[model samples]
Target: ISKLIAACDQEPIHIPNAIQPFGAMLIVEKDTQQIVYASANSAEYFSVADNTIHELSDIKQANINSLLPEHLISGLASAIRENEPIWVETDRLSFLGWRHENYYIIEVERYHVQTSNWFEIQFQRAFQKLRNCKTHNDLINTLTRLIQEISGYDRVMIYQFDPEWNGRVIAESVRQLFTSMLNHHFPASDIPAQARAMYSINPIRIIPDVNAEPQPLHMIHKPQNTEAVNLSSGVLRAVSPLHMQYLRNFGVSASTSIGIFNEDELWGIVACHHTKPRAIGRRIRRLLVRTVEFAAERLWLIHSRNVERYMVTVQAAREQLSTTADDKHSSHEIVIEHAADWCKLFRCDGIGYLRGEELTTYGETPDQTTINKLVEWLEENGKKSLFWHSHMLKEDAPGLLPDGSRFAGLLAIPLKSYLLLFRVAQNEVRTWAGKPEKLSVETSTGTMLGPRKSFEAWQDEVSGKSQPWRTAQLYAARDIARDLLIVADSMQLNLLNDQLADANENLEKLASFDDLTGIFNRRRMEDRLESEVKEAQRYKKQFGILLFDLDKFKSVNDTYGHNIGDQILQNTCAAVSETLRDTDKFGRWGGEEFLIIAPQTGMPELMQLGERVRAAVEKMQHKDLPAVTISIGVAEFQNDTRWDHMIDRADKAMYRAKENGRNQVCS
Candidate 1:
């Protein structure tokens, strides 16, 4: 955010006009294989033929096939599809070529094969060890030792970045003369944003000797191009002079860094250094890079699985808080029952829920006066964020919390009320490699930043901070907060509506139930009949109705009084219900008559249902009531415009059944 840091951020490290002299480079047009550019060292490097010409023009004008191995020159066309550095070798030189833009960049180094057989042997042994690491610390410690062992560096240290982009040396492997950089904090300005991004994009970097002079490229022809061609993707990239100077100041002669990534993001890097020049073989260097990559992936897996276990614990905490009744009393009881447990879960001294003027709290929490002030502040500020946390309350919200207050760390998430966790001050000391700043200097042209002259470990007494929140903890707080609000609403409403629940139950039944026979009422029967007719016609499936009435029911009412007829009707419905199949739906259609809606039933099935129910009525015998016999008529659904038309057809069939006999069935 400052203009000073932006100096290195905008510096074009990718397009430096020179490369380290460990290798030679050439740029050629892809279409015609004509050389357009060559490094100053290319002519001397490829003096396989004692030609008369000298200088870059001599190398550029010469045939590309002669400059490069003839056998290696055959496959640039076929190799372009791979879009990666293709390796080949001659008797005395090794070739690495890749396609970039419209040209081909070919680099020549000292002869070295891939050495895959030995690498494969080392790879298998490393795989067995790294795969068994179950913690982030374990994986990284093993990684630093393994990388140093394979690469043979004087020191290999893994510096993990903090939230501020400052780095801390978490793990290290060093020889006797090397002072341990372990636990030393490094400045943010040491690695700029662009350099850090390059670490991830191109994960491996090697500097054989920091003091070696860089070799500049010479254009084959005058005024041929305007800008330096990009060499970010190449292996022989040169470092910025400022960085080289810093390395010398730090007493390092050579450096090799391998990137450690969390997915695609640059999490940190393996920073290695040597006191004297150590040019690791190009082939073995690549093999060592794979060793770091294997460890990064394994560490990510370990961290991911740990995150799921945190999620599982968070869900369990939410459900336990919701058990029992009374939004205030029940949740308060549960909170107290699990008080010390919740406190330790978030690694806090205290935890609680805040609502109204009350705090349902456990463990050591802020008193009422302090909470009242926080609750009022939350109404205004806490509404903006899903979660709010601070390691230093005096800096974060000055004059809000009392100065005498011992608590320094606070994390809160909102629900019906706020879920608050608290921690006390953790004053400690930090050890920095040097004063953490880029010293400003005035040059002939303008101001530029310079590295500090010394790296003596300086100690600073720190205060007013606590442990910062982790990503997994933040997500867990969010999840538990959401569930608490829901469970509070659900359980509170449910227990209060206990009596209303029963009233509503019968309320639904009355709309569809018959009072006398406990079957469908006339209104419900009409709705059922209409639904069945619509379903059968739309799907072209057969369903029908059986309509029947008691024979001479009025005569029975006259002879045995209407009370006796009521008894007969009740007994008749009971017998009919038992005789009919479960699929058949019957109800009191009208006085002395009933209707059955049989789904998935044709004419034959409808008739069969009618005969069974009619015979069941004939067999009915009630004490002090004459035996009742019923006549039935069946009608299958037809393609009628209105469902009422089907009802009329069933009416005629019922008349024919009554004319035939008292207990007969017809369709």
Candidate 2:
């Protein structure tokens, strides 16, 4: 209504003049009062850089709040509560018009650059995503992306140093115009030893802009009085230009970094890259530092939490796997199911289980030839513990493997009865611009990459073209290797436990049989014979005994030595054994004499068995003496004959047989 009247006869009001510079803007929803639409400045305000653009598509993913200041949180709540319009002005940046029935208006004055009131707004508005991180990777990725968004850098990566000063890019968040620096390894010289040493005393280091001039040390450069020591807080006007130029040689125009510490030691850095010279204001720098510090604390908490969770999970898995680890179960299956998990734990490409010569794996399992070559290499060099080949593509890699082989990148872990290997493949590309000396990066991004040599250096100590390792993957690999060792140990324990149980059962069985003959011994025979005799008597079945004395046995023993005599005895036993049926029992009754107890056998059957035995004895080897013969006495259990009476009668008959003809059967 107002616009119509103003345009009536007068030079009409020019609302387009006020809105043209914005390119295009529209209310997201008239009823919902959200501002999902914005002008061309939306692109500049939302994206950190080109790589970031490429990585994400939605505004929510960019972490941009879609709703404008129309409702202004408090005003919206008030309007909703009171069920009426609530007009509000928020620090001159916005005019929020909150009306009844969920309608509102927000006119934003500006966006992008941090305003003086951003602090107050930050306290009121910033999302608490940092609190959601649950692992070191989560924290690092979150912080890198957040800071990169805030500062609008080309690439944001986390650079961590080892004890020896080597650097590694652990995480990366980049704009579409840039490449990732994740997993890129770098040299110890990239961050001087002196620079690393300072991290112990301080938790943060800010390199605002490498291109800025160094602020000459103040004449009175003593720390301001405070109870707490300030390690990273100071107002230095500029940074080292010489170092900036050095960074330019490698392609980095502007950069900022903050150190990540673990227990007062350097853990890593939040490294940022810019294509053009850039600067950060003091207030912005302070805000970034605080945000990182708060986020770091949360990160440390999540790191410990994840470590604990991992330990618990792995321990339980090991226990379960140990119960059934063997040839039947196929250790390969066990390793393959968890191969991806193992790779993630060690941050490697893949994990393998090389049983004998075959390489079996689950996550990115490699080819057999490659695994075989790696195995052979490990055998020859004794470098089979665990591999971290971040710089495998370099021309100056240590000759741990055969020269000219395409074995560029790999990490190997040897299990008890198998070997696990992780190889690098070209999947993601990365690029970084920094000092020529800083040109060296351990990741996939660096233009000047090479093999890492440290432990392997001693092998070619004098003339090796290898350079020292400059990646954090080595130490991280150490953690992974330790885990593999644990798996190997648990598997071995199960194997040994099974063998022991089997041994115990075998030992018990050994107690009952004669080791030499695999037959029942005298003690066992006596027991079984008594039981058979009692059963026969109870059933009124005939039980017979054949008492036999070998004739000319003394002469044979005299002719041959005792050893031969013993052989003859064994031979005779074997022959007699063949004649006996399952129901018959045979044992040595003292030395030269023998006894056979037969159940359900009548006189005829007993005599027939006796004859068979006698015939078998006659066939004994006695070439140098008289033919072997025996006198047998047969007795049957009668209703009148007792057990002792039958035995006595058989003895008398055997004596009569001996006197009668010296080779005859008596009954």
Candidate 3:
């Protein structure tokens, strides 16, 4: 049974070995001139008027010249050579001939006249109705109604194939007495893949009556070649036995199926059916097929224009992103700004931008943990070009986002970073005409594939799927995703620029200044002293080093709070900084201590400088801070090999000044 169902696609529907009884078929072989095969009814319907030939079946082999008129024989030769179909008329019958592979298959039916006026009127009516259709629904509904009215069939249905090739009957025009198949579903196996492909290759398929006895073809035995004859082009070609059983189970006595195309590919079908046998005339069938062709052309026009319109809007969105690239921003800001519009355009519930290892999401999306897993899967699996989309996440990637059941669709662009669009699953129930279960029949030759026994209304819940993304929408997604990278890259540059400025500031802070007092720190002060001593000694000139310490600093800090002590230092540093000459460098040496390197100065001048520094602190009288005083000691640059000796001497002098009396200078 599994073999039968799986091998259904390989069924030989092209060579069914028989044909309908409405027309007599005669097949002629190439290279040799003889009628190789004839339908059982060919002799009764069509005979040579000249009596040059007896009944065709009465002989084992008949030459083509004996049965066919010279005019038709000449036309058949022309048609076979050019690989085009030819139509000829006699007073009694009409003949249509076309080359099928190695043979020329001719169809003979009664020749009849169709008035041109009715055909013109009917065409105009159909053409106008189709033109007036305003929407896709309006067009399909009007077409089904129009086809049903013209053909006088019990029902006319127009359905479209889904991504999986299953069909949903979207529009139907049926009389009230019959059951409706509108909004009903059929499995893909209903029409096997090979038969589906034939619908695209052949012009149309019509069964005058499912129960009609198929006329078997009688062949002239040949020693050289023996293969089942191909009747693919036969207008009266017999139906497959399984298909006949399918139609019988479908409660259809006669049916006609016309292929609707999106370009050269089959898009769907226009199915016309009747409760009892109805043999529509050849003229009517041609008119019906032509009408569908016009509608198919219109359908293409609608979709093409829609695609053009969508592409324009997508380019418009690209311009918006282009502007953001030149400005200063981050991918985070861009994602936030573009989220709503992107969600609307892509038709998603959520949107996210993951750039530079940061993720920003808007609306409903998977949590960070789930998103990481999904991205990991995408990377480990084939990282497809441009974009990857899935409507059912579980089917495509099992165990991915198992906790995230609310959403079932993903459209992700995997550049160096990721841009994602998410969609919520649809929970609607699908109405199927049958259960779409496994079909197996106990045939004489083991188990064989069979049609379902019932088509009663059955409902099945569609699971783990959202409304699918269109191929055209993906086109827009790929373009938009690349442009987002453009915007993100531009924004990325601004972030790098900001880091540069911050780094320059950090370099200055680390090397020099005390942030609290806004002065050169202790590290800078010692280096300045060493440089001033070097230059002063080279010229045999003296420079002074003064060490100043704030008196009772610990007591003041303990009495008031640390903040108040800090305020005292800030005020004192401001005053001392003003007292220093241009030739002197003042810096915060340590806690409650400061230093000054005065160039080209002896002990007398240095003492005067220290007294000036002492007077500056003596003038302090701020109510916000306690009274603060400094004890300063000075030493002139002597014949010393090291600057640290000068610092030690200045430090001892400063302690002696502090011991003598606070707020006084010592040298």
Candidate 4:
């Protein structure tokens, strides 16, 4: 039964056994205006009996010639050749003739041509009213009221389709006699896909009565496609049996729907329903077409305006994010302080930030443990790209979270760190016009699906789902993620530069200072000596170099296993550094030996500095070790001597100090 229902689109509605009972129809040979086929109900209006087939000449008993003018009869050949429906007006009947295949089909009905001017006035007024409407809702309300008033139907509704092709009654002008269907949602299957495609070609569909006995066509010559004739443009095209049942279930006797198009796509329909059988005159259908055409144009314009406004807002938010990047602000603070803006950029409700091992949140977010679990899941499955989003998170990635309703939608931008945005569940309560329970009924061929008998409002509540993310928003998210990646790269570069500066500082220390004593190394001291000599030569100022050595250092190392001797050397440097002036440069000369460079000082000042160092070294103590002292020698740079001579004199003086006394200063 389900398969049969699905296959209902293949039903030969154009070749059905019945048609609308509001009019009588006939098929005639194009070469000879002789009738080849007549509707089963042809006897009611013309000199023809139901179920009897005959030619046009045999209808003389009813004097059908009195209804059709001789001028129209003469032009029937040209009209058939042109393949356009030609209309002829008379005092009582209106005739429409068109060629299909090898025959010309004609339909005659009651004429309402006298009221054409009145309908024209109403159409112009309704067109103006629809044009004046500003917003979507306003236009909908205007169109529904205008259609209901013009059609004189029990209900007129503006049914708008969602992305999934489901329809909702957005606006309605229903009579008090009928039930209100405002805001009632219908599943996509209610109209089905194939029916929607047919509406594109023929935008207007009318059924004068659902319970009318359909008339069958009697054929004289078989058509080229013998299976069925295309009655797409026929006004009396029989509807699907399933659809007839659906309308009957709704208690709608007569119905018509005019398609509302958005550009080339069918956007929705202005559906009109009547509780009793009703026939709309051709003049009224023509005026309604004009009215709806104008309204559709205005509706497209209004939709474009709303889209423009929304895009402008998105662009402004995009610019704000770009500005934040340009400012080189701290990312942590930006994520926290501008969290709301971040969420609004994606139209979400909450945001989360994960940098390294820490996580921070803003607005409503999942608990820490759940976030951790989600991160782990992402690490395994979400390595696809830096940007990802989901509307149904639970279904897409199951077990990542149990109560996904809290954060039903997720937008993630992962780079050096992670930035996640979420939207709360919508928790929609959809009201349906019927229960939508499919019932199977017995038919001659087989059991077929039938429409639900009930039309009462049915409620459906859903949680753990959010509105689907739009393509434009996804594209915008990728752009924003790209911008953030650039900002993150810039920050990383700055951090690298800071780290490089600190490394260079440490490298400078390693090169210029002794590793053990924290004093200037031999090479750095030599460099200092050359600078001092150059200064003394230029300014005729005195600068001295003091050379000192720890006395009996070899004996101390031999007794204390060298480790204590190393400590003694470190202690000696500390003592000398304490006594030296800020202008002096104290550094290691060699093993057990040290040097000091003094500016603006001669032999006397150097000797005093040497004595202070000797006294400080004499007082230096170590556990179970003898007191350590240093011999000193000093010399001043001379303008007449080479720079190396100053260092040679200091070496000679330091040996002389050791010969005089191990713990006394000499210069």
Which residue runs does candidate 2 get wrong by more than 4 Å? 1-116, 123-158, 168-186, 196-234, 237-257, 270-282, 308-546, 550-593, 596-629, 633-660, 665-667
Q: Over 4 Å off in model 1, which ranges?
A: 48-57, 70-72, 79-83, 112-117, 316-330, 355-357, 382-387, 404-406, 441-446, 461-463, 478-667
Task: Report the alpha-carbon TM-score of model 1 versus the true structure.
Answer: 0.68
Q: Against the unseen true structure, what C-alpha lDDT does each candidate score?
A: 0.78, 0.55, 0.81, 0.76
For each candidate in turn, the TM-score is 0.68, 0.45, 0.79, 0.83
RMSD in order of candidates: 18.0, 19.7, 5.8, 4.7
| Backbone clashes under 3 angstroms, per model | 0, 26, 0, 3
lDDT of 4: 0.76
Model 2 agreement with the true structure over 168-274: per-residue lDDT tens digits: 67889877766565665565544544445544433334444555433221111122221222112122213323334546554666777776766565677787788
TM-score of 2: 0.45
Highest lDDT model number: 3
Q: Where is model 4 poorest over a 10-residue stretch in terms of lDDT?
A: 48-57
User: What's the lDDT of the predicted structure labeled candidate 2?
Assistant: 0.55
Q: What CA RMSD would candidate 2 show? A: 19.7
Better-scoring candidate (TM-score), 2 or 3: 3
> Could you arrange the candidates by lDDT from highest to lowest?
3, 1, 4, 2
Measured on C-alpha atoms, candidate 3 has an lDDT of 0.81
